[model samples]
Target chain A: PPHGELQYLGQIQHILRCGVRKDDRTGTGTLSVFGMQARYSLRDEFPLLTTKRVFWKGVLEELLWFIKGSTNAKELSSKGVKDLGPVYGFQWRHFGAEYRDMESDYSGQGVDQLQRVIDTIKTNPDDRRIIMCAWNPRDLPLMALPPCHALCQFYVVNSELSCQLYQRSGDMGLGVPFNIASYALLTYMIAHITGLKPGDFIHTLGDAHIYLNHIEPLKIQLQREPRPFPKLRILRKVEKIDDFKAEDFQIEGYNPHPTIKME
Target chain B: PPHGELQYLGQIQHILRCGVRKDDRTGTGTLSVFGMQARYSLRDEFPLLTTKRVFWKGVLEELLWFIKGSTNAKELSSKGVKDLGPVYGFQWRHFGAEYRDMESDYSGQGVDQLQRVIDTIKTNPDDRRIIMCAWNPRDLPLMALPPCHALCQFYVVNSELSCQLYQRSGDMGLGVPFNIASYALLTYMIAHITGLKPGDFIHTLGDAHIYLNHIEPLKIQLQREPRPFPKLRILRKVEKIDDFKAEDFQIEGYNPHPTIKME
Candidate 1:
């Protein structure tokens, strides 16, 4: 019965109650569950989690950067991640193409997956091959950090576009809330340009874990009830996926509880 | 609440009740739902569906073939799939490597993902990057059929290895039961060699659907209660992953309500 923001809160609650104790690569001990799925309905509403304030700026900036196929880490230095070498955007745009530093022009070099997804959605909506992958095996070593949100598939049916993301590992306290927002925004953006309604943002997690240090803060946030999700409005009449910029989006009526910090 | 076989049944019920009408690549109309997850415990039993009799021979044969890294389609002619040009096994064993025809000597070539998974689980249990992906954009055109069970990630916690599979499209009536059995068997085999207990086979679907004609037969299946799942016992003391043959496995106590046929 849990959908939208409630699903996010419930996952944290489950990890606290029934998850196993395990130490991760970060050396931060966690209460981890193997697999978890949460569905967020994007029908006239955006799923920018209301239990706690998600960073709207980073979500939009990073996604636009991904759409641009720019793997330049210095451009995304505002999010505190520096020196990211050919991560999400690179894999999304250029899968098997050679990565020669962050400054080289990779225009029309490799498979244009983002453009391919848009074209596929517009022409053959029912095609099951409408997938964009960021988990390229040959390109992993070139990445500063391995992709957590690895692969995503887009499905079109009944004049609606739905996206499902497979995340390898999710830090429930910090990363997951932002992940939901990011993907939901992506679905909205794609739907906006493709002339379809945003259906759902389904997030399937591999290692859904709550860091042991984040237990108390999550419990405090869980006690709060989720408010109504806000609706997304695209200001521009954008025909292409890449034409839209950060100024084009407007999130109306997102009133949330105060932000909770996690490391 | 719905865990093992019940989860599969519940999905059928949900699709019949609330699924959207969509035409797939086959031109057969489907009642489709996007993004569903079911967890089947592999601790003491294998999840061979008890609601309907699954093809045990094909599950074992195909899996063993996959473990062999053999892309030779004629070898698996018993399963009705012919001329499978570089599908699951090829991707699993030698991803990003060049694919010559089915009868080429490709020993110690490409990324040995299966071997890597076993070694990683044994050496670095907590590592989050233990993923085997079959969805290669560069290699999609080479495949006769795109990989349905696209990507999988293995997780080890408390000395139990759990695997989560991300399937792009699933034929609920014909393919899902066999898929559950196939992956469960894979987890069991990998666990036996890695010296870890098989934990859970988490099957996550992107577009979970039932063919229009399959709805009636599935209703008959939903009425039947699930019996106890069978236990998979590896007959030989297998230390290495690929060394185990099809004869080295046993499925004990598999009583099922009849088989359901679909096109």
Candidate 2:
């Protein structure tokens, strides 16, 4: 049986072709993109790209980095992952401070903070404020590249952990799908470690847009009925959150249409 | 004119007493809350709390840690501040892996990411995608406490950097004011470092509620008229975003009503 699926590529193409646009504060274009949310029970199947070849390695690495709340690109490069320059890591590390006098609240460094957050959620599901931020106004000027997928938070309800990501700007055609899969996997990983079930993965985009360059391919994708979502299977069972590695998971049976081009 | 005059303490107190109350996700009830946005011109005055003593030291240190993307409590405790536990730092340091097979991405480990982000914004104004994230879902279950103010992002336009923050759930009467002031100060600090001006601070709240318990104080605050806002000042001029010290800033000229108790 085909798994759950939702597609908006055709709708996005229509908007771009029709010149339906909104006034972005940046004055980039009049066209905005579309966003969709899909849920797959881990007990049912894993989510993967059956159409064009999805860069699973890049997807996995990026997910791990985000779960760690890193914005630097070095870790990705070191792991042989391609694409995505130091976007998120840069924002997470250097939210500018020269302009504002930040209050001294918690002292543990970045990595330690990530660990503590994970521990709290697993050990104490009652705590409702699980969150991580990357956008710092001060850091914008200094970064080699500014962050796009800015902030995100997670919640656990009824023994199921869910993820909600807030992207200030989204290259809908090029980036949104990957972000969706990545965060969904993140929810799965957290649940796997915390002994909770994976619930919903909510992807909220602030400035979601499809670049004018990638229109035709999106239409093609939209025309094709979405195939059943495949099952994402993690190979190993890990006790601690940090102990799990990238290879532990595998995507099986994702069968979509042909791949579409962005640019 | 005294710069750091206390303003509206009594009104704040009144609002706390008469605001609506609700049961928070964390079970912390009877919360008072409000969501407000204010524009402060860097050339005119700064927005710092002069009413009652504000924790300048605590604020600055916490900001620095966040820019570093550190989620640990140890560093904060070492700095003589205590509020958030080791959750933030833990997420930053030990974010969970994407799968059980691959290595983890730990590029955004220190203060450098913050500095890099600021540099990019100053030099590259055309690249409008400026953002930062602090909420990591994978780390949520492990956290000692979940983050309330989940994600914040900033954009620079016309020489002014505007900030937008998204809170999944907010206690409007009690938490909103502090969140407003905190982000405003952050805007000021980022502007100072990037050599840009400060613009409007926009806040969008999710699940913004006035706790049922504090309706009386809110009513009283509504009855009282708000006084003139005071001027906020940052003492030192620092080139690097990470070099800022907490003592270099001060708030002046705020006069508010007395504190009202909330049930």
Q: Which parts of model 1 have CA positions greater than 4 angstroms off?
A: A1-3, A73-83, A135-139, A142-149, B1-3, B77-83, B135-139, B142-149
Which 10 residues in a row give candidate 1 chain A its minimum summed lDDT?
A: A139-148
Model 2: how far is A111 from its true place, Å? Answer: 5.0
Q: Pick the candidate with the highest lDDT.
A: 1
* DockQ of candidate 2 relative to the true structure: 0.10
Task: Evaluate all candidate structures by whole-model CA lDDT and list the values in order.
Answer: 0.84, 0.56
Docking quality class, candidate 2: incorrect
List A-chain TM-scores for all predictions.
0.92, 0.74
Writing each residue's lDDT as its tens digit, candidate 1 over A156-189 gives 9989999998878888999889988998889988
Worst 10 residues of 1 chain B by lDDT: B139-148
What TM-score, computed on C-alpha atoms, does each candidate reach?
Answer: 0.92, 0.49
